[PDB]
Amino acid sequence: HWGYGKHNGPEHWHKDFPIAKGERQSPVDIDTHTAKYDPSLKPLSVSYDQATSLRILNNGHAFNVEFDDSQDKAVLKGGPLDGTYRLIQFHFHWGSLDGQGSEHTVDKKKYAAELHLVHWNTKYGDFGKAVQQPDGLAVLGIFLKVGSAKPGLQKVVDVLDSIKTKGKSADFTNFDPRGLLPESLDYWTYPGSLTTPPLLECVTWIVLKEPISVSSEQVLKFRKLNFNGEGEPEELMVDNWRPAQPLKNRQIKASF
Numbered sequence: 001h002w003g004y005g006k007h008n009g010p011e012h013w014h015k016d017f018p019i020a021k022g023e024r025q026s027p028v029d030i031d032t033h034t035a036k037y038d039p040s041l042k043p044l045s046v047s048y049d050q051a052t053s054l055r056i057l058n059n060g061h062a063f064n065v066e067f068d069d070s071q072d073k074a075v076l077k078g079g080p081l082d083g084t085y086r087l088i089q090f091h092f093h094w095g096s097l098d099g100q101g102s103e104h105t106v107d108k109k110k111y112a113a114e115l116h117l118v119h120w121n122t123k124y125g126d127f128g129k130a131v132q133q134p135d136g137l138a139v140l141g142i143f144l145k146v147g148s149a150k151p152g153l154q155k156v157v158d159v160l161d162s163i164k165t166k167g168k169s170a171d172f173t174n175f176d177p178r179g180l181l182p183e184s185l186d187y188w189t190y191p192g193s194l195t196t197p198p199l200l201e202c203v204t205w206i207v208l209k210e211p212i213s214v215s216s217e218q219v220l221k222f223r224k225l226n227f228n229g230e231g232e233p234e235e236l237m238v239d240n241w242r243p244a245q246p247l248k249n250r251q252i253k254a255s256f
């Protein structure tokens with residue numbers, strides 16, 4: 001029954017998922033003065049032109065926009081990655097106030113939200129197999145700050161009213177995730193983990209430097225979602241972020 005409350009929040013996860021205190025947990029704070037430029041990183045390739053969204057789901061901790069990954073449509077390659085990774089879903093983490101909500105931080109700065117585009121390494125054949133490997137996933141993370149609206153986000157925020165509570169889903173076809181990317185693909189990268197249980201240490205993190213801006217009204221509608229299921233007392237879905245974890249031996253590399 002893990003979650004983000006006082007009794008089931010991130011300081012409790014280790015009891016059911018002892019890897020929470022592992023050697024390569026996420027998220028982390030990105031200290032921009034310790035991260036080193038790595039000229040050996042290859043150019044990053046985000047190929048989302050043929051992405052096919054299917055559905056949007058409130059899963060009790062966030063909402064997933066899910067993609068048909070049965071073929072090689074929307075893929076992420078290059079940068080630190082070896083091979084091809086297929087997009088399977090994206091989701092966000094956000095706070096109750098604009099001063100918090102991201103998972104990664106940048107010189108301890110917290111953004112209002114953070115977008116995660118989750119991809120799995122097609123050499124392992126399916127997602128389930130990929131999450132048994134130290135290079136099975138790649139997550140593209142993008143910070144959200146509040147300012148001007150992101151037009152590319154409005155189809156997402158407008159469907160949220162139809163998936164208010166845990167377990168609800170809605171059809172969500174033809175959504176183009178290219179509409180959520182910033183201008184620059186400059187990034188930081190490090191090896192890490194899922195930020196939610198089961199916290200598997202299977203992820204190459206690629207965190208973009210440039211945030212996207214969304215409006216106060218768009219993030220306010222994120223905060224109207226519910227953690228609870230239908231007819232249950234209302235628990236607003238806010239602060240669904242894990243705080244920064246110990247970097248341990250790892251090295252954060254910059255692509256710029």
Ligand SMILES: NS(=O)(=O)c1cc(C(=O)O)c(NCc2ccco2)cc1Cl
Nearest residue numbers: 116118131137139193194195196198200
């Ligand atoms: N927050 S996150 O981007 O680290 C993340 C978050 C989630 C999530 O479900 O919140 C998730 N679900 C799929 C899954 C199940 C086991 C391994 O990956 C995958 C990822 Cl990578």
Ligand SMILES: [Zn+2]
Nearest residue numbers: 059060061062
């Ligand atoms: Zn959940």
Ligand SMILES: [Zn+2]
Nearest residue numbers: 091093116195
């Ligand atoms: Zn996430």
